[PDB]
Design a binder for this molecule. Structure first.
Ligand SMILES: *[C@@H]1O[C@H](CO)[C@@H](O[C@@H]2O[C@H](CO)[C@@H](O[C@@H]3O[C@H](CO)[C@@H](O)[C@H](O)[C@@H]3O)[C@H](O)[C@H]2NC(C)=O)[C@H](O)[C@H]1NC(C)=O
Ligand SMILES: *[C@@H]1O[C@H](CO)[C@@H](O[C@@H]2O[C@H](CO)[C@@H](O[C@@H]3O[C@H](CO)[C@@H](O)[C@H](O)[C@@H]3O)[C@H](O)[C@H]2NC(C)=O)[C@H](O)[C@H]1NC(C)=O
Ligand SMILES: *[C@@H]1O[C@H](CO)[C@@H](O[C@@H]2O[C@H](CO)[C@@H](O[C@@H]3O[C@H](CO)[C@@H](O)[C@H](O)[C@@H]3O)[C@H](O)[C@H]2NC(C)=O)[C@H](O)[C@H]1NC(C)=O
Lengths: 142, 87, 142, 142, 87, 87
């Protein structure tokens, strides 16, 4: 069966680094073999190869933030195994006034087992932009 | 849209949406409603869509404001009211 | 049937924000169920899930351009419905002399209906680079 | 059959512009119809359409490097034909101290013939970051 | 390649291609052909591949030039001629 | 991990891994082992994971050092030894 997903971003009062998502706007959940759990992770029910992707857009400033880049990581929790990092991207903070906008895009082919969950986290969630289109997260089974 | 979620003793999540027009820079302005004077103002990208306020006084009725700018042209000042809790 | 596309960029005297493309170089049009219409949009003829992507590369300057980022948006015109935005990416203009080069990449899983057209537009088309490889746009059906 | 790949980056003493990769960490080689040859290229054995992608993350400085951007190109060697460029991305060097981190992402649909090899190269390989997740390269057959 | 498309009263689209070599910065230079003096020069990224000229005089034969640079080394000056229209 | 590969007359590839913690900036420091004084120090992003050293003396036992920093907090100085070849 056709097993794919795409969920839009959603701001929250969390502080914690894990980005929140929602089945809203032009979202996709093909069937119950992919699920969005607690707004934070796309969990699969069948073993195999998936192309997982995510796009973080953020506005940041070099003076306001600490001397350290914006890192977005796409992580994997498999059942009965430790956390794992799959993809990462790093961007220096801009020198632009109020803030400087930039987008990251992560995408890759990984092997998910049954019950495996993937999620996207960031260094500073307060800097993540959440306008229509700008920040999204998805998956599709080969 | 201009919603106010997760209001607690000292904090509150402001959110909005990209429906107004092709604006770029906005001013999130807030302060105590009807205690005339002290107002905090915050420069934000229009498409950022969120700000979390902190260091608010408890049991206090606040007032939020959001005007947005494209060059010299400016948007319809979109207001909202909220009251913090207590403990 | 296998339904995918990939079209390279092509400069023009348009002023209008919608980017132009061509079936040239290492382009792909698998069969007539995906079509490039008027050089501006990839129109589909079968309902279902597609991974749509686009890559804009551009050269810009902070002093020359207005205090506003470079936004590229991937849009959807479905038949009998309003225009819609699917993905967006924003980048501050660089402080580099003549200009500063940077690339955006948008990609996501969306549901296209029959006769639906997708297109990529930008804030300032004059800033878009059009060298071999740098700016392209495509699609593939799941 | 299911024909996909994903290989992580690996530093080396090469000087030459072609990036090195390895079947390590969360790599994928589905079956022998995709192969990683000499750590530098993903060679295919069946004709058809593939979505090829790569992600370069790099740390660079504007003063240290020459007045020229960071270009990453995804190239194609087909048997009995010249070299070809498929995708490219360009980024100005950052003004940040020691260096400024940024990520590129290339992805597109191309037609590979049997025995065709794809590879990713860069302007300055010494600037490419090789931490877990940051730099990777892959492929998947439609 | 160095083509000149969409020539009108006051405007013209210059395009080129990435065949010359591994160049970085180029100078698009133009002006009136055989009215010796006034020349406009424009710094462009080699891989940009396009510039749209404006504010040209009508009914006038212009001359375009494109030299490209990699450090101190410089490319073969690639020329082209075009004549604006009138209305 | 902190490996030293491809050691030749004048050169050597230093590599490491991202296992230590959430560090940002590091100092790759090297010099001649037991010829007290002259030391080269190199600022590197923690997640860069590689540096290629050059202009080393042949037939010489060198010493590499790698301390990493997150704000004021600093990592466990991770050392390694290597000896260049000759020709
Ligand atoms: C996104 O989530 C991932 C996964 O939870 C985070 O990676 C984890 O980061 C922590 C904190 O640095 C690592 O803990 C460290 O473990 C090492 C080895 O045991 C130890 O030497 C340190 O003292 C520390 O306890 C953890 O290992 C690491 N996990 C993996 C799988 O790499 C990551 O920090 C988050 N990313 C962002 C940008 O917030
Ligand atoms: C790329 O194309 C899209 C789709 O055409 C453009 O989005 C559209 O932008 C216009 C101009 O801001 C929006 O019009 C506005 O509509 C609102 C609501 O009715 C109204 O309050 C404003 O007065 C104005 O008329 C339009 O809604 C919007 N469409 C969608 C679907 O969001 C976009 O501007 C283009 N992007 C770039 C970078 O050029
Ligand atoms: C990544 O690899 C590709 C493919 O090998 C490199 O592209 C090649 O670059 C060379 C050097 O500029 C080009 O050579 C030139 O050929 C033209 C036309 O024959 C000639 O006028 C010049 O004198 C020079 O010999 C070569 O054509 C070009 N190949 C293709 C297919 O475009 C590229 O340089 C590498 N990229 C990076 C970032 O290192």
């Amino acid at each position: 069966p056709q097993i794919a997903a795409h969920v839009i971003s959603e701001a929250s009062s969390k502080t914690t680094s894990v980005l929140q998502w929602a089945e809203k706007g032009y979202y996709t959940m093909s069937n119950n073999l992919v699920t969005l759990e607690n707004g934070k992770q796309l969990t699969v029910k069948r073993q195999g190869l998936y192309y997982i992707y995510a796009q973080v857009t953020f506005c940041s400033n070099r003076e306001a933030s600490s001397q350290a880049p914006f890192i977005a990581s796409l992580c994997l929790k498999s059942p009965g195994r430790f956390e794992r990092i799959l993809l990462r991207a790093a961007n220096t903070h801009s020198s632009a006034k109020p803030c400087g906008q930039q987008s990251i895009h992560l995408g890759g082919v990984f092997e998910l087992q049954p019950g495996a969950s993937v999620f996207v986290n960031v260094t500073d969630p307060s800097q993540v932009s959440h306008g229509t289109g700008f920040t999204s997260f998805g998956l599709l089974k080969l | 849209a201009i919603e106010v979620k997760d209001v607690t003793d000292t904090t509150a999540l402001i959110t909005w949406s990209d429906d107004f027009g092709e604006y770029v820079w906005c001013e999130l302005t807030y302060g105590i409603k009807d205690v005339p004077g002290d107002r905090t103002t915050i420069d934000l990208w229009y498409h950022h869509a969120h700000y979390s306020i902190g260091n608010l006084k408890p049991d206090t009725e606040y007032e939020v404001s959001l005007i947005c700018r494209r060059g010299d042209m400016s948007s319809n000042p979109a207001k909202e009211t909220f009251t913090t809790g207590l403990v």
